[PDB]
Chain A
Amino acid sequence: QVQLQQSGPELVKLGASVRISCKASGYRFSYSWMNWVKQRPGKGLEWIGRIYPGDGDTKYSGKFKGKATLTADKSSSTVYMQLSSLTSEDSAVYFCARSAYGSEGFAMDYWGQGTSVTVS
């Protein structure tokens, strides 16, 4: 049973940085891109980036490179995300998704419950 467990609600100040974790289970962790997706309170989904824990290969969106950095910990089967220089814009719900495999269109089949980052 694939289960992506994310961190709890997060409250940070302007200009700080936050560590969002997503613990993976139920599947071989090293062989699936973990996607991080932003969702502002009133707007739609907004892909942030992805990390392949196997090779630890991170590919970010054009507008999220540097702002967001992904890392993986295979020992704990966890995927971490640093948001740096957080501003009021970054306040949103962040989801982690399993991304299936290439043959299945990299479909983000399993998702985490979401981490609500509030920048104030």
Chain B
Amino acid sequence: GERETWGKKVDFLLSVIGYAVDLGNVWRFPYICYQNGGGAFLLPYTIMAIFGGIPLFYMELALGQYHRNGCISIWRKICPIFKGIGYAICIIAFYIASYYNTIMAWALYYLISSFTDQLPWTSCKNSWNTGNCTNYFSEDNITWTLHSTSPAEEFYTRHVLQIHRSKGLQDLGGISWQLALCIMLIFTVIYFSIWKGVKTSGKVVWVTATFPYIILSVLLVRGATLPGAWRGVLFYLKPNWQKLLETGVWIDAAAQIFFSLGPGFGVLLAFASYNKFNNNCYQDALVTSVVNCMTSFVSGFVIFTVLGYMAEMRNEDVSEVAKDAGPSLLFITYAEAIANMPASTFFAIIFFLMLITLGLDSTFAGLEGVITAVLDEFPHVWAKRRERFVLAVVITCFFGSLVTLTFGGAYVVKLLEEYATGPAVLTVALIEAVAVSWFYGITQFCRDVKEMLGFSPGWFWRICWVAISPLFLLFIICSFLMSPPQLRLFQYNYPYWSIILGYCIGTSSFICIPTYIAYRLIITPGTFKERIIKSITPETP
């Protein structure tokens, strides 16, 4: 087969690292770690990474490399009835692209807004500011009334978001042309990065996957030298071992590691499908997973040095400084830090460029998974003319993201990020692991891995894939189902119909798998036993 291959091994490694290293490594993991015991949380995170995310990462990489097919078509070679998984994954991508890119747009907007001599989120003198605004790092002579807001909070909520113009999820308001242009530029960059395939995405990730680390090192050096950063680092690391007793800590570690590594989104599979057959996907999986986890740790150091600095300038514990987190931590809290620190313009420019790149590499990977899946599944129509299909994918993602550009767009972004990554994607990943372990047989998968690498996976990997990784995903799914999210943003309690809409989004993502199972059973003739067996067995070309 004349299939495309990575120009260089570094291209694949950096593509995977950029995929797994997103803004979640920077603002999800550190907040979750501090909330769940700080240093103690490194014990769940590690454990659920060793027996959880990493086995699935390696399994997906090996599967994609061996079968050299995308998310949709690969199930022809593993378990045909589960072909619907592919389509489900595609839908998930859309939902992700509906909000993911929007967040990047915000960063881009901030980036542009950060090119001024004085950062616009520095003072309360601006048009968007209201009477509640008060300088965050003001002298103690002026008290911080509970109703007060910081200038950066005003800039985020009223200038860029204009959230004040939306009464909630029911009244999103109009579309902000500024964010519309920002996301249009974002999608132009995305398209022109992933329109010729891996031969261009691999080269683009050289900048989009390494630059975030350069900026992270710069920001770590900046924060470590800030006054009061040691207190922030101590809060980050001070272990609350009692938190390990709570099940919620382990639940959060599981969810964080799964959604950080991203095993089960059809993206690692698509990236591996371009690897050379005999390439070592075991080493690649280990290297990329440890890189992602260490990036999460280092970015937590970066964030919490600054949080401790901010907690020192205000005589407050880091708990009040962090508040509630979200994008409201890199756009309000950290943005306040940049505004206060010297050389604020340069640090803001690099910080928001880092956010843009951290998002861009992951979006490249997420959309490339879908593009590869469709290209492999329907080559008779898309094998050529790939550029126009990628254009169609980008246009569809932009149209899906239009709702997130409204003045109530932040509410929709939070809704999607809470429900797009709900138990639907976890169930899809669990069914992937089950199909490749039980239905396809762990022995056959290990034989394929031996044929690729030359050595069969050890008993640890077999046990993980067969029992623990499916059990890991099932544990997360049960956690998500038996605890609905009471999600809240900007003192706006989400309504119950929003929860029902999130359930609808999740099922629409997942309802592809049962629908295709029923379709495949119906089409295949024979009795029910044969009707099922003939479709479980991988098709032989």
Contact = CB atoms under 8 A, between A and B. Distances in A.
A51 to B, nearest CB: 10
Interface stretch (B129-137, B185-193, B517-525): B129-137
B125 A57 contact: yes
A101 interface: yes
Contact of A102 (B128, B135, B142): B128
A6 to B, nearest CB: 23
Nearest to B128: A102
Contacts of B126: 102
A31 B122 CA distance: 13
Query: Binding site of A, secondary structure by majority: helix, strand, loop or mixed?
Result: loop
A102 B129 contact: yes
A102 B124 CA distance: 9
B123 A104 contact: no
B142 A54 contact: no
Given A54-B125, A55-B125, A103 B134 contact: no
A55 B133 CA distance: 14
Interface in A13-33: 28, 31, 33
B127 A106 contact: yes
Nearest to A101: B131
A101 B123 contact: no
B129 A103 contact: yes
Interface residues on B, range: 10 to 19
Interface string A56-96: 01000000000000000000000000000000000000000
Contact of B125 (A28, A52, A100, A103): A52
A100 B129 CA distance: 11
B129 A101 contact: yes
Contacts of B142: 28
A54 B135 contact: yes
Contacts of B124: 31, 54
**Among A54, A100, A102: residue with most chain B CB under 10 A:** A102
22 contacts: A31-B124, A31-B133, A33-B125, A52-B123, A52-B125, A54-B123, A54-B124, A54-B135, A55-B122, A55-B125, A57-B123, A57-B125, A101-B129, A101-B130, A101-B131, A102-B126, A102-B128, A102-B129, A102-B130, A103-B129, A103-B130, A104-B131
Interface of B: 122-131, 133-135, 142
